[PDB]
Design an enzyme around this catalytic site. Sequence first.
Site, PDB file in Angstrom:
ATOM      1  CB  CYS A  32     -17.139 -15.244 -12.196  1.00 45.43           C
ATOM      2  SG  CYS A  32     -16.986 -14.869 -13.844  1.00 45.43           S
ATOM      3  CB  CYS A  35     -14.389 -17.321 -13.559  1.00 41.24           C
ATOM      4  SG  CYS A  35     -14.506 -15.499 -13.611  1.00 41.24           S
TER       5      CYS A  35
END
Length: 105
Positions: A32, A35
């Site tokens: 991700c 993230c």
Amino acid sequence: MVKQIESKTAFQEALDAAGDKLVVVDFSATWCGPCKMIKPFFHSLSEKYSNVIFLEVDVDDCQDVASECEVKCMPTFQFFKKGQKVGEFSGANKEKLEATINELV
């Protein structure tokens, strides 16, 4: 400062040891991008808000925690007080992360 949770047992104990304090959990994954993008800001909030506990859970280390906490999205931020989930959202939204905190602490 941000503390990495590496078992369910450690998750549960952190929520217990928090007492009355707000706990903010970042559920993240290595795949991700967003993230990773928000990690420094998450850490920044941990330094700014010494009255809030900040935890990181990598969903691939703690699949059980992610599953039991009903995580669906990457990143997900969940919020706890006295062991109970009081908020959740997905996405790497810095303002939202701070506005949610400002609402719950």
